[PDB]
Amino acid sequence: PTSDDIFEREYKYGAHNYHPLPVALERGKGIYLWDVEGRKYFDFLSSYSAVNQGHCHPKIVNALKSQVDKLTLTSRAFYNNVLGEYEEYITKLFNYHKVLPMNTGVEAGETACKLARKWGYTVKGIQKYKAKIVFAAGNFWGRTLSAISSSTDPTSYDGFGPFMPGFDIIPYNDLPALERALQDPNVAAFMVEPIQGEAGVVVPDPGYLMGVRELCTRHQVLFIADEIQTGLARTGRWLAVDYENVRPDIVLLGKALSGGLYPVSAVLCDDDIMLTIKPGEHGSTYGGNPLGCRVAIAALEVLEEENLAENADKLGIILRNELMKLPSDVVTAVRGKGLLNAIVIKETKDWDAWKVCLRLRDNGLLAKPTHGDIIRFAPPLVIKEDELRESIEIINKTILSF
Ligand SMILES: *Cc1c(COP(=O)(O)O)cnc(C)c1O
């Protein structure tokens, strides 16, 4: 099992919907990854902020092993003993009345849109099937037909058939645009990411989230905050929106909600929106299973108990300050919050972000390019200062070797 054979096996038998970086990973622990050759790598992608707590965190692994021997799935046709405990825990932690559990982020987004439409028809009084949902340009919340229907990325939706009606798109970080869009009374919700991760970690101006909250409240529009990637202490707070002390109507969570051990996602909102969905009107087979509930409880407990948010804040300050010392000769921009950061490099004929990531892999650091000039830096939140500093040294060497 060399790296080449693993690549060839995936190429021969698997679909070609991805072009991963040529690394064949076989072990993971905390912040480190090991390939089949035994090489050691710094993980600076964190599986898209899903292993914020580190790879194979002992407390989450123990919870999964304890639950797997007793009960893993009953389906929602009956009750299990774990779901209610997790629901109470999460609802108290994030200060919302109810949580609707799902498995993946796309499912939470679909649930959020369904909630928005049902609330618009039943509570707001919009005439049926005229309800609109507004999204921000550069948004990403998955690859379902509805999700790509709201994407501004041509690779996401080009050639994928007719698209879901009722979706409007406005520029990100543009309060006047949202105000103008909300003049349509048929708007039911505005869905937005506090920081657009897939777009290249674009950070809105301070006060943007406050303005969005005020505009949504003024025009009775549901504020949907997609914190699947930004939430759970990655940006330095429990939710990135806590930076502006803003309370969205709906909160989406996922990925790091399980520490990478299980597909678990959640839709958090109060009774006045959640109870528009009557029994038998929405659900999922694996949504709310006891195994995922135990895993999510363990994952959130290690986040709270290890103060990963505060460490993320301090270490992100250091990371951005060090990355800004990089010459504008190569690094055109540095941006981010907490340990969700990105650098935009000057792409030329000589080099691009793909080559930078290849050389970073050669030097023991794993990162992925998302635009051809944008490189993501997102190590697990359990990093210590010295590990971060030596990772920064690796990044400096790779950058200044071109
Ligand atoms: C990752 C992502 C999703 C989709 O999550 P999946 O589990 O891959 O379906 C949704 N919203 C945001 C902001 C994301 O980063």
Numbering used by the authors: 38 to 439
Give the article text.
pmcHuman ornithine aminotransferase (hOAT) is an enzyme that catalyzes the transfer of the δ-amino group from l-ornithine (l-Orn) to α-ketoglutarate (α-KG). As a pyridoxal-5′-phosphate (PLP)–dependent transaminase, hOAT has a “Bi−Bi, Ping–Pong” kinetic mechanism. In the first half-reaction, PLP and l-Orn are converted to pyridoxamine phosphate (PMP) and l-glutamate-γ-semialdehyde (l-GSA). l-GSA is then prone to cyclize to Δ1-pyrroline-5-carboxylate (P5C).
To structurally assess the influence of low pH values, an X-ray crystal structure of hOAT at pH 6.0 was obtained with a resolution of 2.1 Å. After model building and refinements, the final model presents three monomers in an asymmetric unit of the C 1 2 1 space group. Although no major structural changes were detected in the overall quaternary and tertiary structure of hOAT at pH 6.0, some notable deviations were observed in local conformations of the active-site residues. Acidic conditions altered the position of the Arg180 side chain, a residue responsible for initial substrate recognition and binding. In addition, the side chain of Glu235 exhibited relatively weak electron density reflecting increased mobility of this residue at lower pHs. In the pH 6.0 structure, Arg180 moved toward the center of the active site occupying the space where the substrate would be localized. At pH 7.8, the distance between the two side chains is 7.8 Å, but it reduces to 5.7 Å at pH 6.0. This results in the constriction of the active-site pocket as shown in protein surface comparison in Figure 4C. The structure from hOAT crystallized at pH 6.0 revealed that the enzyme’s active site has rearranged side-chain conformations that hinder ligand entry to the catalytic pocket.
